[PDB]
């Protein structure tokens, strides 16, 4: 078969391939995503353990 490269970059999300599309179609604008930013830091107890290590 084909195989995935273990050194492939970060794959785009289903969200980016919906947001990029809605920006390119003009049904969103960046100013309406900027006024919708949400800085909730992810996996913060995995970081709490990493910082002890």
């Amino acid at each position: 078969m084909m195989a995935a490269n273990p050194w492939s970059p970060v794959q785009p999300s289903a969200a980016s391939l919906l947001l990029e599309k809605c920006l390119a179609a003009g049904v969103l604008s960046q100013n309406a995503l900027d006024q919708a930013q949400l800085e909730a830091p992810c996996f913060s107890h995995a970081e709490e353990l990493q910082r002890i290590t």
């Binding site: 992810c42 996996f43 107890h45 995995a46 353990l49 990493q50 290590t53």
Partner: peptide, 8 residues
Amino acid sequence: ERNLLLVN
């Protein structure tokens, strides 16, 4: 988070 903890 559990998958990251299991690797830490």
